[PDB]
Amino acid sequence: GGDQRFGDLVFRQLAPNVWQHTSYLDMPGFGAVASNGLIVRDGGRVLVVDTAWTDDQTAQILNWIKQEINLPVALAVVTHAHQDKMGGMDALHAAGIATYANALSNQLAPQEGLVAAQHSLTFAANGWVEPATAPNFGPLKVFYPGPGHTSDNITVGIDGTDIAFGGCLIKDSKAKSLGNLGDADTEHYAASARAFGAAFPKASMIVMSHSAPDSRAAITHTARMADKLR
Ligand SMILES: O=C(O)c1cccc(=S)n1O
Ligand SMILES: [Zn+2]
Ligand SMILES: [Zn+2]
Numbered sequence: 001g002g003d004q005r006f007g008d009l010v011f012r013q014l015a016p017n018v019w020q021h022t023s024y025l026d027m028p029g030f031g032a033v034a035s036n037g038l039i040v041r042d043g044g045r046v047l048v049v050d051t052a053w054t055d056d057q058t059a060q061i062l063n064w065i066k067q068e069i070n071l072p073v074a075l076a077v078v079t080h081a082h083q084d085k086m087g088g089m090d091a092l093h094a095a096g097i098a099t100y101a102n103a104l105s106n107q108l109a110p111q112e113g114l115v116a117a118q119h120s121l122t123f124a125a126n127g128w129v130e131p132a133t134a135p136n137f138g139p140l141k142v143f144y145p146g147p148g149h150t151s152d153n154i155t156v157g158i159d160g161t162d163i164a165f166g167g168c169l170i171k172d173s174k175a176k177s178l179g180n181l182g183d184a185d186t187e188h189y190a191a192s193a194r195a196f197g198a199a200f201p202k203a204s205m206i207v208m209s210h211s212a213p214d215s216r217a218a219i220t221h222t223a224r225m226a227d228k229l230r
Pocket of ligand 1: 030033082084149168178179180181210
């Protein structure tokens with residue numbers, strides 16, 4: 001009903017200062033796969049969570065931001081070294097945008113056929129980002145839940161909203177599978193899922209890479225499906 005099309009992307013306002021960006025890529029056995037990230041206005045700047053699949057699509061995200069918000073993009077954080085999350089890093093860099101990822105994502109990105117972020121996040125033992133490594137993140141609350149979908153997957157809550165972003169760790173409350181497990185940590189996936197849920201106990205809107213936003217039943221149901229792996 002409320003989704004705004006812009007070229008080949010889709011933008012959905014989730015909250016006063018928060019939009020979901022969605023881009024698509026054909027893959028065998030799936031069709032044209034939606035990948036979601038976030039756009040957050042924080043005062044006079046914009047923050048991005050995840051690229052689109054490609055440079056061109058990512059440049060279109062920046063064009064939408066220019067048209068609809070018309071404020072500088074201060075930074076992007078990208079939530080692991082796969083194409084749906086880091087495929088457009090060159091577009092961000094060309095645009096002069098500072099980029100952040102888990103240290104491990106930056107380490108894996110070259111061999112994944114991806115471009116590393118410019119800055120590395122590190123995490124306390126409890127999984128909260130070390131705040132000095134995430135300067136100017138404003139309302140973004142970055143959390144490493146443990147290895148799951150990938151060894152390097154991270155998650156993002158938004159202060160002052162009921163939104164938490166699971167990226168490709170979380171699936172929707174009616175999801176059939178855990179999707180791509182080629183890089184999954186089969187032993188630990190199950191626990192990582194429930195850690196995300198625990199880190200963001202108040203969030204009623206669970207946003208994720210490959211489904212529309214859902215209730216926390218997404219977390220309960222993802223944890224459940226994961227339990228069957230270990
Ligand atoms: O693991 C999934 O849920 C998944 C399914 C289809 C495509 C991609 S990129 N992912 O991560
Ligand atoms: Zn992935
Ligand atoms: Zn994915």
